[PDB]
Amino acid sequence: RVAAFDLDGVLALPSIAGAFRRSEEALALPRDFLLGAYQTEFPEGPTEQLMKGKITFSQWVPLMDESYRKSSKACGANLPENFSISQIFSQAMAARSINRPMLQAAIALKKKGFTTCIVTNNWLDDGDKRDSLAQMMCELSQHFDFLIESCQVGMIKPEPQIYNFLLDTLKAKPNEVVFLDDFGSNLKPARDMGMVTILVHNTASALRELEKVTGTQFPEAPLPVPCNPNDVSHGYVTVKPGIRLHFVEMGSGPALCLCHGFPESWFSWRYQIPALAQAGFRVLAIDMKGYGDSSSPPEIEEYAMELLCKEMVTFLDKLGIPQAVFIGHDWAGVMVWNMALFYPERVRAVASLNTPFMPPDPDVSPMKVIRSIPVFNYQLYFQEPGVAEAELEKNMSRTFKSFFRASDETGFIAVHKATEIGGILVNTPEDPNLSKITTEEEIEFYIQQFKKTGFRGPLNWYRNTERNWKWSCKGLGRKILVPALMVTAEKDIVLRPEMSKNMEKWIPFLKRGHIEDCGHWTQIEKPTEVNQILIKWLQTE
Amino acid sequence: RVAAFDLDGVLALPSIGPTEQLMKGKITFSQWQIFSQAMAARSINRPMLQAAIALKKKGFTTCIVTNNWLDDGDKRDSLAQMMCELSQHFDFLIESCQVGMIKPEPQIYNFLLDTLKAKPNEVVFLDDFGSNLKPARDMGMVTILVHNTASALRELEKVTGTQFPEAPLPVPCNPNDVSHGYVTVKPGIRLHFVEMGSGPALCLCHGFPESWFSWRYQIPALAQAGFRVLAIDMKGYGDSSSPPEIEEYAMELLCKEMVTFLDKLGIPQAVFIGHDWAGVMVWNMALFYPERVRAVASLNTPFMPPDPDVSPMKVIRSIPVFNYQLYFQEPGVAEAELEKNMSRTFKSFFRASDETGFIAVHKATEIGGILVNTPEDPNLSKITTEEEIEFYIQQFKKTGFRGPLNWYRNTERNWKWSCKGLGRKILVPALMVTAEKDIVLRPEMSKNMEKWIPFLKRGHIEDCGHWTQIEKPTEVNQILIKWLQTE
């Protein structure tokens, strides 16, 4: 089966046709005077030349204005002497956007496994604001297998051949296909061909109703569009002789680097990458040193935070980028705060998820501080080379299902006792049922990513306590004056909100956000909420 | 050997208790006014930066030992660009506010020497203060006092190193010291590219028989000019998928795949600028996908639409200078010649408008080989280095030549496709840069262009052949930037 959508009217609103009627009234001319050009059946003149893509937009402007001057005052109502369809048409175009519940309904049937597409009477926009259209087209791109645009294949609706070309493309019969459109006259031939007709009258709802009435049903609040993974651009930068970072890229300027935490990957930001790009930014979801597709050397000294921060700067220099907004989580969160503290010039802004900015005391050995907090036990367990590696690697499937579970789920990790019972996966069953926060598919990606790195590299992050302490002490007399955000996860066992209360002594002006019923895996557990927060912050400051 | 430079006023001009330590690094800047802009209103000293890339090219360890400070300023990006930019020309960066030390504190110098791994002899230092220089000559290293704006400076500086010019080439980026991207547009097909700088997007597309490396002189300059460069490897070339099917290089399909390359990359609009064959594609992008084209620029290649009453092969068969174009039409044939020995192939192809050993564009068929009239041992053009030549050799050992040549082989369908937009005009911003002494693709072939592209802006370079970018880089750069800034 397959489902196809017209764009002006079902995937995109308000129908541009709307602004046609609006100014029709706005000028005293006869019902369908200006809309006849766009909504007809028998399309002639320049509009047919347009939607068949024989002439661009700009050309059509003058030529149509004149086809109007004829028809006009010269056969009915007075069409102003100095009058033009240009700024009115190019505005209801730029003043229109996506119909989410509808795009939502399509992503569904696709996720469900349906051939989706768009069959629309397009035109080539050489307009002053054709950008609005490129974005809409860019973004809709991902969700449909096919896109039959009138202005590219030379047909137009209801002219019969377009439909027949649709079927030849989807390679199907008129039965297995459902057609959504806002005109109905454009729908008269589909039914007549043995197709399903649904008039997208409304704005959806009444139409998505007679839609679940065939196939399935759509979430009340669907989870955001996750970016993934063979559909993405993969970058590679070589920062130092043997070392090279890998990352993923989406969207257009200004730069914003998403840094993940232990034991994850760039794929963790899967829900924020799209949304963030679409929000106007050039996303760079990087694989941290020691992870996935970047260099994972064995030396411990190699993961010192001082050296890790220096190499983030180099990653920008080689990439040509002079400033980015860094937003980290877990361990990256720490790094990110140190980037803000050590390389302010390169930081447009900083955001942290769960991880507070916790500077060190120069009169308090750093290991002692870890040895005291009952909840950083595992942190100690990790301190010994080969040990935790061996446990985590024995069976990567449990390891991941064990680690990634919701704030309201069982099978948890052993952050408190690890060293007594010797392990974190010790009390964890060796067949965790699968969290409701990830899929086998998602789990598999992490498995594969770590078969390439093993776990030494990632763990070496925990192993630089001393020097890290000695390094950070260098900026105890400074303050973080660049823009900052702190988002806290309520039910996050380690890295509890309360650990941030003092933060503003170092970061005045620090803005703040907070998510309830949320554990450590903020991005994966409360994505939409994280997205909302993150965007508002980026827009606001 | 080594060369050290300051910045307070040597690689950047105009020049510039609690302050005594802003330098060391304890307090930031903001934690401290009609002087911040004195930082913003300053820039790089190119003759001084030039000298440095010289010694580096010449094989020297180069560096910057400066009394820095942390800028949490509101206008701190000035410093980011200056720094980001200088970044690539120095191997080590001994910034005071980073290692806790400040000239003339004798330790910083003992720190420079350590890092570098050397004695005060093989090391010349450059400072505009002289009182911050006493220690270095005291240590046994060569001191130089920047008084002028580099002049006598770079001179006793040359009296020591060697000879830098005065009208130098724009610095070339190169070729592992850059970020490499990879996008998979269709099941088996994937494009590779290089990226530099920050937004808005601008895709540089190369021509036959080249690579992304061809834009080596425009990539940096362009990035630094404020743009996010995407110098792509065209289908069939270097590190992107080079399938064998001919139908695979149809311009219609090639243009469609440029759109997809943006969609996957998230970019909704870019300025395309092509050259040679890409130039053609670029003009067709503007003509077929205006929505995605911020702007279009072409180098040498005019916009030459087809006539619907003139078989396209006939049009090639007539022009005496598209002979090779015909030679290419047969599969395996030109591949075999070009591939036999890739070194000649490239030295043969890349030579200046004022050089011998040329290619056989006219007589190709007749004498049966576009290289037959070439010195079997081309001496090396003055426009490329063995090093540059080698990169192209290696890039083509991976693709062979079938893929690239399949571009010439879609005459029919290309003709049939382009005819679809003969009733349109190119209304998006456009630029046409013509190379004077370009044998094929002569300026004169553009004269009619504005019938299709009114408002078409224009540029022109003299004493220039087909390899515009490589032959007149600085001039190409100048032109290209003004156009991007202006429109």
Short mmCIF file of C-alpha atoms in Angstrom, two decimals, chain B residues 110-339:
data_model
loop_
_atom_site.label_atom_id
_atom_site.label_comp_id
_atom_site.label_asym_id
_atom_site.label_seq_id
_atom_site.Cartn_x
_atom_site.Cartn_y
_atom_site.Cartn_z
CA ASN B 110 63.02 28.07 28.90
CA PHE B 111 59.51 26.68 28.20
CA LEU B 112 59.55 27.54 24.56
CA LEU B 113 62.92 25.91 24.08
CA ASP B 114 61.72 22.78 25.95
CA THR B 115 58.55 22.37 23.93
CA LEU B 116 60.24 22.98 20.61
CA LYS B 117 63.00 20.59 21.67
CA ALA B 118 66.08 22.71 20.90
CA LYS B 119 68.94 25.08 21.72
CA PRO B 120 68.79 28.94 21.80
CA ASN B 121 70.89 28.88 18.61
CA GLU B 122 68.52 27.39 16.06
CA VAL B 123 65.81 29.82 17.10
CA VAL B 124 65.02 33.37 16.01
CA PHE B 125 62.55 35.41 17.99
CA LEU B 126 60.49 38.43 16.91
CA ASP B 127 59.08 41.04 19.33
CA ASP B 128 57.91 44.67 19.05
CA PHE B 129 59.02 45.54 22.59
CA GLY B 130 62.74 44.83 22.77
CA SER B 131 62.68 44.88 26.57
CA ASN B 132 60.77 41.56 26.21
CA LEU B 133 63.65 40.51 23.96
CA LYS B 134 66.69 41.10 26.23
CA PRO B 135 66.42 37.53 27.78
CA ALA B 136 66.45 35.65 24.39
CA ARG B 137 69.72 37.14 23.01
CA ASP B 138 70.96 36.63 26.62
CA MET B 139 70.12 32.90 26.20
CA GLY B 140 71.98 32.51 22.89
CA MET B 141 69.08 32.95 20.47
CA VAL B 142 68.64 35.32 17.52
CA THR B 143 66.58 38.41 18.34
CA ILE B 144 64.83 40.69 15.90
CA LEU B 145 63.04 43.93 16.77
CA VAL B 146 59.85 44.72 14.85
CA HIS B 147 59.85 48.51 14.49
CA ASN B 148 58.35 49.12 11.02
CA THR B 149 55.22 47.31 9.85
CA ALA B 150 57.38 44.29 8.90
CA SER B 151 59.74 45.86 6.37
CA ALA B 152 63.25 46.03 7.86
CA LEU B 153 61.90 43.40 10.20
CA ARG B 154 61.23 40.67 7.59
CA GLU B 155 64.46 41.93 5.91
CA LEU B 156 67.14 41.23 8.61
CA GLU B 157 64.66 38.40 9.01
CA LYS B 158 65.31 37.37 5.45
CA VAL B 159 69.05 38.08 5.89
CA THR B 160 68.74 35.26 8.37
CA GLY B 161 66.20 32.79 6.91
CA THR B 162 65.95 33.39 3.14
CA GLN B 163 63.74 35.28 0.64
CA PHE B 164 60.01 35.84 0.81
CA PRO B 165 58.31 37.67 -2.10
CA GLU B 166 56.04 40.75 -2.06
CA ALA B 167 53.09 39.71 -4.25
CA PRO B 168 52.56 36.19 -2.94
CA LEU B 169 50.02 33.59 -3.70
CA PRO B 170 47.01 33.17 -1.47
CA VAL B 171 47.78 30.35 0.98
CA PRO B 172 46.76 26.82 -0.14
CA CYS B 173 44.90 24.59 2.25
CA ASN B 174 46.04 20.94 2.15
CA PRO B 175 44.78 17.73 2.22
CA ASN B 176 44.61 15.83 5.56
CA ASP B 177 44.80 19.03 7.65
CA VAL B 178 41.13 19.44 6.64
CA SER B 179 37.74 17.86 7.53
CA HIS B 180 36.44 15.21 5.13
CA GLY B 181 32.69 14.68 4.69
CA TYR B 182 30.75 11.79 3.19
CA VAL B 183 27.10 11.71 2.17
CA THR B 184 25.23 8.78 0.73
CA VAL B 185 22.75 10.16 -1.76
CA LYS B 186 21.40 6.86 -3.21
CA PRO B 187 21.98 3.18 -2.33
CA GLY B 188 25.31 2.58 -4.02
CA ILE B 189 26.30 6.26 -4.48
CA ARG B 190 28.05 8.56 -2.08
CA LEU B 191 29.75 11.93 -2.54
CA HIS B 192 32.90 12.99 -0.69
CA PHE B 193 33.86 16.60 0.06
CA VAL B 194 35.98 18.91 2.14
CA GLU B 195 34.67 21.56 4.58
CA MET B 196 36.03 24.78 5.97
CA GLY B 197 34.63 27.92 7.58
CA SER B 198 31.25 28.85 9.02
CA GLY B 199 27.87 29.60 7.33
CA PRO B 200 26.27 30.36 4.83
CA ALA B 201 26.94 27.37 2.53
CA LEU B 202 28.82 27.59 -0.73
CA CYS B 203 29.60 24.51 -2.88
CA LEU B 204 32.69 24.58 -5.11
CA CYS B 205 32.28 22.04 -7.96
CA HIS B 206 35.38 21.12 -10.07
CA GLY B 207 35.81 20.03 -13.67
CA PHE B 208 37.40 17.36 -15.86
CA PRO B 209 39.92 15.98 -15.14
CA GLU B 210 40.33 17.42 -11.62
CA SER B 211 39.30 17.22 -7.96
CA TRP B 212 38.27 19.19 -4.90
CA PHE B 213 41.98 19.81 -4.42
CA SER B 214 41.77 22.13 -7.44
CA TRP B 215 40.05 24.78 -5.36
CA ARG B 216 42.90 24.59 -2.89
CA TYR B 217 43.58 28.28 -3.17
CA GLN B 218 40.02 29.46 -2.87
CA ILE B 219 38.91 27.22 0.05
CA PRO B 220 40.89 29.03 2.80
CA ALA B 221 40.41 32.57 1.47
CA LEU B 222 36.73 31.88 0.96
CA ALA B 223 36.24 30.50 4.47
CA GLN B 224 38.09 33.42 5.96
CA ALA B 225 35.82 35.66 3.87
CA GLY B 226 32.93 34.52 5.98
CA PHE B 227 31.58 31.41 4.26
CA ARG B 228 31.07 27.67 4.94
CA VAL B 229 32.95 26.08 2.04
CA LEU B 230 32.02 22.64 0.64
CA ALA B 231 34.60 21.83 -2.06
CA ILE B 232 33.02 18.59 -3.41
CA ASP B 233 34.56 15.63 -5.44
CA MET B 234 32.19 15.26 -8.35
CA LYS B 235 30.55 11.97 -9.15
CA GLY B 236 33.09 9.60 -10.69
CA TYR B 237 36.06 11.42 -9.06
CA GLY B 238 38.58 10.95 -6.26
CA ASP B 239 36.87 9.80 -3.05
CA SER B 240 33.17 9.74 -4.20
CA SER B 241 31.37 6.87 -5.96
CA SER B 242 32.64 6.39 -9.52
CA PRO B 243 30.13 3.89 -11.07
CA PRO B 244 30.73 2.54 -14.59
CA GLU B 245 27.31 3.00 -16.31
CA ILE B 246 27.20 5.94 -18.72
CA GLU B 247 23.55 6.76 -17.96
CA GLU B 248 24.85 7.38 -14.47
CA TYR B 249 26.43 10.73 -15.48
CA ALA B 250 23.48 12.26 -17.26
CA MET B 251 23.41 15.89 -16.21
CA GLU B 252 19.73 15.57 -15.20
CA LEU B 253 20.60 12.80 -12.77
CA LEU B 254 23.78 14.64 -11.70
CA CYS B 255 21.79 17.74 -10.80
CA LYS B 256 19.15 15.80 -8.96
CA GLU B 257 21.91 14.27 -6.83
CA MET B 258 23.22 17.69 -5.87
CA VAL B 259 19.86 18.51 -4.41
CA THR B 260 19.85 15.27 -2.47
CA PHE B 261 23.37 16.07 -1.21
CA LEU B 262 21.86 19.19 0.37
CA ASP B 263 18.72 17.50 1.77
CA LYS B 264 20.80 14.79 3.55
CA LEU B 265 23.21 17.47 4.79
CA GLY B 266 20.33 19.52 6.05
CA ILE B 267 21.39 22.57 3.95
CA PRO B 268 18.40 24.19 2.14
CA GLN B 269 20.28 26.66 -0.08
CA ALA B 270 23.86 27.13 -1.21
CA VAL B 271 25.69 29.22 -3.74
CA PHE B 272 27.01 26.95 -6.43
CA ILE B 273 30.08 27.89 -8.22
CA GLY B 274 31.37 25.58 -10.95
CA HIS B 275 34.15 25.43 -13.51
CA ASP B 276 34.56 23.44 -16.76
CA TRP B 277 31.92 20.69 -16.69
CA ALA B 278 30.64 21.59 -13.20
CA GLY B 279 30.08 25.07 -14.65
CA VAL B 280 27.49 23.48 -16.97
CA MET B 281 25.82 21.62 -14.08
CA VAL B 282 25.82 24.71 -11.94
CA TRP B 283 23.98 26.68 -14.73
CA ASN B 284 21.48 23.85 -14.88
CA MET B 285 20.99 23.86 -11.13
CA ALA B 286 20.12 27.54 -11.42
CA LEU B 287 17.77 26.68 -14.23
CA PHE B 288 16.13 23.62 -12.72
CA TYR B 289 16.33 24.06 -8.95
CA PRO B 290 16.22 27.81 -8.29
CA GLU B 291 14.85 27.35 -4.71
CA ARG B 292 18.13 25.76 -3.64
CA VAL B 293 20.41 28.26 -5.32
CA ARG B 294 21.45 31.29 -3.30
CA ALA B 295 23.65 32.12 -6.29
CA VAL B 296 25.66 30.78 -9.24
CA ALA B 297 29.08 31.60 -10.57
CA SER B 298 30.87 30.05 -13.50
CA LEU B 299 34.50 30.12 -14.43
CA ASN B 300 35.22 29.96 -18.17
CA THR B 301 32.07 27.92 -18.88
CA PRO B 302 29.25 29.92 -20.49
CA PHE B 303 25.63 29.05 -20.22
CA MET B 304 25.08 27.48 -23.65
CA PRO B 305 21.50 26.17 -23.95
CA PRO B 306 20.63 23.85 -26.88
CA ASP B 307 18.46 24.40 -30.03
CA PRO B 308 15.60 22.02 -30.48
CA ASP B 309 16.15 22.00 -34.23
CA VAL B 310 19.86 21.17 -34.20
CA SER B 311 20.99 17.65 -33.24
CA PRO B 312 23.51 18.16 -30.35
CA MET B 313 26.17 15.89 -31.83
CA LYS B 314 26.07 17.96 -34.99
CA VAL B 315 26.88 21.02 -32.90
CA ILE B 316 29.93 19.26 -31.47
CA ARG B 317 30.96 17.85 -34.86
CA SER B 318 31.13 21.39 -36.29
CA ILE B 319 33.26 23.33 -33.72
CA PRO B 320 36.86 22.45 -34.72
CA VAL B 321 37.89 22.85 -31.09
CA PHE B 322 35.74 20.18 -29.53
CA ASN B 323 37.54 17.43 -31.42
CA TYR B 324 38.77 15.71 -28.28
CA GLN B 325 35.21 15.85 -27.11
CA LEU B 326 34.54 13.37 -29.88
CA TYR B 327 37.65 11.37 -29.25
CA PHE B 328 36.23 10.91 -25.71
CA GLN B 329 32.91 9.64 -26.97
CA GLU B 330 34.31 6.08 -27.37
CA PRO B 331 34.55 3.90 -24.17
CA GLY B 332 37.89 2.47 -23.22
CA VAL B 333 39.69 4.46 -25.84
CA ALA B 334 40.61 7.72 -24.16
CA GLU B 335 40.64 5.92 -20.76
CA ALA B 336 43.46 3.74 -22.01
CA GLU B 337 45.53 6.72 -23.25
CA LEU B 338 45.08 8.94 -20.20
CA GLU B 339 45.71 6.07 -17.77
#
